[PDB]
Predict the structure of Hemocyanin.
Amino acid sequence: ANSRPVQIFDASKFHYNFDNLNLNGHSVSEINTIIENLRDHDRVYAGF
Amino acid sequence: HSVPFEVFDYERSFQYHYDDLEFNGFSIPQLQREILHRQHDERVFAGF
């Protein structure tokens, strides 16, 4: 009875979780600041 | 970055920071109190 992508999102009904979320020794604020740190340096990319 | 609309906040582009922000032994929380004390008394000023 869980085939609905509308109700598929929250994991409370699924009973699982993670202990930590840090990546490469960087907390949420680290990404939240490196994003604008890289935005300050303008550049170009490609698209396929 | 010769456009003048980001030099207001330098932390993104240049993020410079001197050794200390002191001036004649004046601390930022300090300045408020003596500024208030000076402006408390009435004054006369010259405008050119």
